Amino acid sequence: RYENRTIYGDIDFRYHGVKLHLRSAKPGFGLRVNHVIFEICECAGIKDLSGKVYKSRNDMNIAKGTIEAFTKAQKTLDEVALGRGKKLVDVRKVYYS
Amino acid sequence: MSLVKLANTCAHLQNCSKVRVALTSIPYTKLQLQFAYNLYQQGFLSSLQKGSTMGPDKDFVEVTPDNISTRRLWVGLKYRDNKPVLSSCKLISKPNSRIHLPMEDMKKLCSGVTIRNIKPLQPGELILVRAHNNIMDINEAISKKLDGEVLCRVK
Amino acid sequence: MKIQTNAVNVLQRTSAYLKSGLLKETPAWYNVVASIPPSTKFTREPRFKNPSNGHIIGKLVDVTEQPHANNKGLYKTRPNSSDKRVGVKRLYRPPKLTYVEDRLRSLFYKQHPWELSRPKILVENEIGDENYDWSHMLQIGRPLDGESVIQRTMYLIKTKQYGDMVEAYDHARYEFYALRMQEETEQQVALEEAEMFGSLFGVSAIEHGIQKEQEVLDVWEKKVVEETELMAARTS
Amino acid sequence: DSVMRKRKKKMKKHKLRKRRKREKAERRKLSQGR
Amino acid sequence: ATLNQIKRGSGPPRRKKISTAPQLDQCPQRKGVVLRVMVLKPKKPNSAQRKACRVRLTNGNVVSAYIPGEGHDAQEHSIVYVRGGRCQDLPGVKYHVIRGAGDLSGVVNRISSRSKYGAKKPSKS
RNA sequence: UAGGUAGUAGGUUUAUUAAGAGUUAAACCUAGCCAACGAUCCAUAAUCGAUAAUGAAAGUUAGAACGAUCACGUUGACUCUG
RNA sequence: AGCGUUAAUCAUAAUGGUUUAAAGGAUCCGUAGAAUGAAUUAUAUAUAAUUUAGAGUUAAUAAAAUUAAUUAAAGAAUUAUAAUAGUAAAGAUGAAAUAAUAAUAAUAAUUAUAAGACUAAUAUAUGUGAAAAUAUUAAUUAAAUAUUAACUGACAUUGAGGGAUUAAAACUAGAGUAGCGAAACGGAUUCGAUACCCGUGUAGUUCUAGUAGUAAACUAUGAAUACAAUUAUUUAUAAUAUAUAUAUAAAUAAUAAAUGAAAAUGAAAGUAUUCCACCUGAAGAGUACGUUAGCAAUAAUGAAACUCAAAACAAUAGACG
RNA sequence: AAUAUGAAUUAAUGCGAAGUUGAAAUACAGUUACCGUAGGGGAACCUGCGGUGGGCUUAUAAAUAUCUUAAAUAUUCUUACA
RNA sequence: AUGACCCACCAAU
């Protein structure tokens, strides 16, 4: 999770038929996603997300699909950094909204 | 230079990253060299060397008209926690549809705004921009205020 | 299968449970797999040189690195097809461990097939304590075999006591024969002498050669008792 | 679906029967000087 | 679809919602005269004697309609106001009529949904 | 609606015009010009905004209303006026 | 101080697809393409100038293949037809009927004439062709291979429209016509049998010149390029110190990954790039009508009204044969 | 010239809560089904030809097996040892 | 529950 509220970056994982396209949003933007993604997000912790499901909105598949997106296509900031051999930074706190 | 060649390079690197190959070769051209050099500087690659079709060169070999056909760029792929560091390499500008952005729109792309269906830059992604026959980072292009064709979105 | 994730990622997995509450007491092993992190890269790492024939894997003959018209009387200048057929898989491809000694091994065994018939101690004992001075075709521990002849020809081609491989091997080939010739006499001497010195023998090579054979005859004789006869009724 | 394709067959065959009846009307007073 | 192919025009199927009551030619309620009047059998799995009329309209387009409510004043040659709506069962009446205009009346004692079925607040003493 | 076009395509020289141009009128050359990236022909429609509506946005719709443009005042043509 | 409903508009998914659900063109050649496309350098993002990786061209060495068109041969049989001798059935079917079967002496046999179509094994359609297609033999002509070597110097990727070829049937001429077999007629079977079965057997199947331009023309899978993990067989082919074990390619068969609604695809149905064709619920409909083309049958082009909340595919149980 | 509306008669198709005849398809659906085409037939359909599998990968024995210290040695073995 | 109906069999590689 990013800042303990939303995903790290916009994603597009395709599970079976469901093509989820969730996008991280500014702190505040409430939970705006498919009913199922909402209850997963409600229990996961995500309280600021937004996205859409295209080909086949297979209710259950959306749910398997969503948690799969969170673990497959959501690399945390540390990983990106350690791996690339660099150090990425967070600028929103460097402003202290 | 040829984006078709760049498209083949980007697809090749993705395929090699999926099969977890440590070392792969790409065609020796100025475009592929500048592309691979930016990936190396940004830490997506472990190494960038000249070579032949057989392997990376051990010693310095001069590039002559006689040997140019055999010359390749050897690129070391990086892996961290059983995952490829170069997970995706996709063209933004296609051979049939080239996307030139002004510096202001490149700045909006870095600031989280979607432009001409190009999704905003995410943390740990790279967008390569072509300005004045050089390839550099999208942020680097904005820093030089060099408006030019966009290129690849590395993630 | 496909490079799995939930195999070398247990600590990451347990850690989460350990930080939340799904677990209360850490799995004892927790620390060990922390102290000794699991190799996670599963890269098909590349090869650069053949561990054996010393050949190189990774070079191209740039044309300039050449000037003598090939035997096919012809100065080649433009690179050739194979000379431009991206050979990257070759680097990953494991190279063949080619050994000229292996050819000599087969050559000797072909020239001396009875050596193959001779029992050999293929079972390798602590190969570590085996430094062997091979200027002589005999060593303590290692028995006599065509393999000794091979390891012998090496001195004659390394030290260069003789000349080419063919000549070298032969020099030791006659060296081997002698050891075998003397052994043959020694073998007979034991018996002859022991035979002429209070020695009784329950069974000899001729005895196994007859008993086992006569035993077999038991089966064949009974077998034809059915086959030949059964046909009489089968045809009468 | 082969059954669906077969129905075309029944339909083309039915239209062929109509064509045979229409063929009588064709090459007749209607298609000559009119 | 290669861009050149889209540039020519080969894109999303644009959903133009064809009218379902065209005969009301792009206009709300239109008035008309009840020609034929009959009762009809509804395509099953439903069965009940359906009450309807083959009204003609000002735009001079004949129409098959359906009379709602339990009680009607369908007198051949009445003038009514035709409305929109499918009769689901009657496989033909694609236009309904308004129980509350022209010569059509308002069901008696109609206690609820009176508007849709035509009726003025049954007042009391 | 697949071939269209003969002032048509262009050229030159006159008439008139505040004035360029087949714009008319005239005269005379040449052979063009347009077209399946849709010509010619037919049908429908006044056009538009810093206006109104809808959406996340691209857009999409409208054209009452605000305002901009056009066009007409029963039809047609012409004429003077200016 | 509105609520309904109706009538419109915007939104509500292409951040699609097309082996098997709509949905790849029969095939290829190739024009336009305001389609896309090598390298290097240097100019102000186009020129020039260089390059050889694409793509070509000509040798020379390998090694053989016949895929077209044409001409000339071969062969087992079949019918018929006499000759001959032989006798009473033959033949067909589930079983039987018939027909010009056979007392005119049949069938069977064995000779002998004639007429046609076809081409066993080999033979895997391996392959060869653009796709149609294509394995009896040869002759001529023509295309098609690999590897070097010389050259060319991006000359290309493939393509709207167009053109060319295009199975089986059909058609128009001319010859031919054994067998096969629509139609026809007869015999069966059957409740009925304008069927399956059986007997004659005509259009046709053959050739020759056409015409026409459609097939489940299907791998139901458009073409091109770059790339990605193994194995086993073909097999091409270099090499080795040929007969060996090696390096290459090529195909075929199992898969990894990946993709996928799944079935499964597997160097493509994967990762990518380019170009063309095509699809947008089901019925109505590839219909009507108009138009072009054809000797014609027809072929292409190709609507709408009316009516439904259906309609389709892969995987699963289960009942059924 | 074009469009539109009428026409005896006539064609196709759609819908309909329970008429008629046969049983073409799905199982080996009782003649394998479809594709192209031709002919025949009350009607589904039957028949000729080539094609396809969206039917036959639905693929599952020629039966025959060889010795060397059989051990007081192999077997026992827990830091080896030596 | 809607829910009055169902109709065909012929003989072998």
The full DSSP string for A40-83 is HHHHH---SEEEEE-S---HHHHHHHHHHHHHHS---HHHHHHH
**Kind and range of the H or E element at E3?**
helix E3-8
**Kind and range of the H or E element at B17?**
helix B3-18
Contacts of E4 in chain B (CB under 8 A): 96
Give dist(CA C234, CA C230) in Å, integer: 6
* Residues paired with residue E92 on neighbouring β-strands, in sequence order: none
DSSP-assigned states of every residue in C43-89: -B----B-TTT--BSS----TTS--S-BTTTB---SPPSGGGS--HH
b (16+ CB within 10 A) / e for B32-55 = bbbbbebbbbbbbbeebbbbbbbb
Q: What angle do CA C176, C179, C180 make, to 5 degrees?
A: 85
Backbone angles phi, psi at B126, to 5 degrees: -125, 135
Question: Is E105 within 8 Å of E77 (Cβ atoms)?
Answer: no
Q: What letter represents residue E34's amino acid?
A: V
Number of helices and strands in chain A (H, E): 3, 3
User: Which chain A residue shows the shortest CA-CA distance from B80?
Assistant: A83
For the record, the structure tokens of C117 come out as: 């018939």
Q: What angle do CA B97, B103, B106 make, to 5 degrees?
A: 65
Q: Is B34 helix (H, G, I), strand (E, B) or coil?
A: helix
For the record, the structure tokens of A41 come out as: 């997000």
Question: Is A66 within 8 Å of A36 (Cβ atoms)?
Answer: yes
> Which residues, at least 6 apart from C58, have a Cβ–Cβ distance to it below 8 Å?
B51, B52, B54, B55, B56, B58, C48, C49, C91
Among A76, A68, A21, A85, smallest CA distance to A49 is for: A21
Helix, strand and coil percent figures for chain B, each rounded to 5: 25, 30, 40
Among B154, B91, B94, B89, smallest CA distance to B121 is for: B154
Give dist(CA E22, CA C217) in Å, integer: 107
Question: Is C51 within 8 Å of C95 (Cβ atoms)?
Answer: yes
Q: Give the relative orientation of helices C165-195 and C100-111 as an angle to the nearest 10 degrees.
A: 40
Q: Which nucleotides of I are covered by protein (CB under 7 A)?
A: 2-3
Burial class (CB in 10 A: 0-12, 13-18, 19+), C13: exposed
Number of helices and strands in chain C (H, E): 8, 0
Reading phi first (left if > 0) and then psi (alpha if -120 to 50, else beta), residue E95 is in: beta
**Kind and range of the H or E element at C90?**
helix C88-92
* Residues paired with residue E40 on neighbouring β-strands, in sequence order: E50
For the record, the structure tokens of A52 come out as: 């859409």
Q: What letter represents residue D23's amino acid?
A: E
A83 and B CB contact within 8 Å:
yes
The residue of B17, B47, B77, B81 whose CB has the most chain A CBs within 10 angstroms, and thus the best one to mutate to test that interface, is B81
Nucleotide whose C1' lies closest to the alpha carbon of residue B134: G45
Give dist(CA A1, CA E54) in Å, integer: 66
Among E39, E41, E58, E57, smallest CA distance to E95 is for: E57
Contacts of B122 in chain A (CB under 8 A): 8-10
Give dist(CA C209, CA E66) in Å, integer: 113
CA of D28 to C1' of G200 (A): 38
Q: What letter represents residue E78's amino acid?
A: S
User: Which chain C residue shows the shortest CA-CA distance from B67?
Assistant: C62
Resolution, Å (one decimal): 3.2
Burial class (CB in 10 A: 0-12, 13-18, 19+), B83: middle
For the record, the structure tokens of E81 come out as: 């106001």
Question: Is E91 within 8 Å of E50 (Cβ atoms)?
Answer: no
Q: What letter represents residue C192's amino acid?
A: E
Q: Hey, what's the torsion of the CAs at E81, E83, E89, E93, to 10 degrees?
A: 60
Asked whether the beta carbons of residue C86 and residue B69 sit closer than 8 angstroms, the reply is: no
User: Which chain E residue shows the shortest CA-CA distance from B97?
Assistant: E3
* Residues paired with residue E80 on neighbouring β-strands, in sequence order: E32
Q: Give the relative orientation of helices C100-111 and C146-158 as an angle to the nearest 10 degrees.
A: 130
Question: Which of B22, B51, B67 lies nearest to residue C63, judging by beta carbons?
Answer: B67
A85 and B CB contact within 8 Å:
yes
Dihedral of CA E102/E103/E109/E112: which sign?
A: negative
Question: Is B79 within 8 Å of B85 (Cβ atoms)?
Answer: yes
Give dist(CA E93, CA E95) in Å, integer: 5
Burial class (CB in 10 A: 0-12, 13-18, 19+), E33: middle
Question: Which of B43, B83, B125 lies nearest to residue A86, judging by beta carbons?
Answer: B43
For the record, the structure tokens of E27 come out as: 């206009």
Give dist(CA C35, CA C150) in Å, integer: 48
Among A6, A31, A11, smallest CA distance to A72 is for: A11
Alpha-helix runs per DSSP H in D1-34: 2-25
Q: Is B27 helix (H, G, I), strand (E, B) or coil?
A: strand
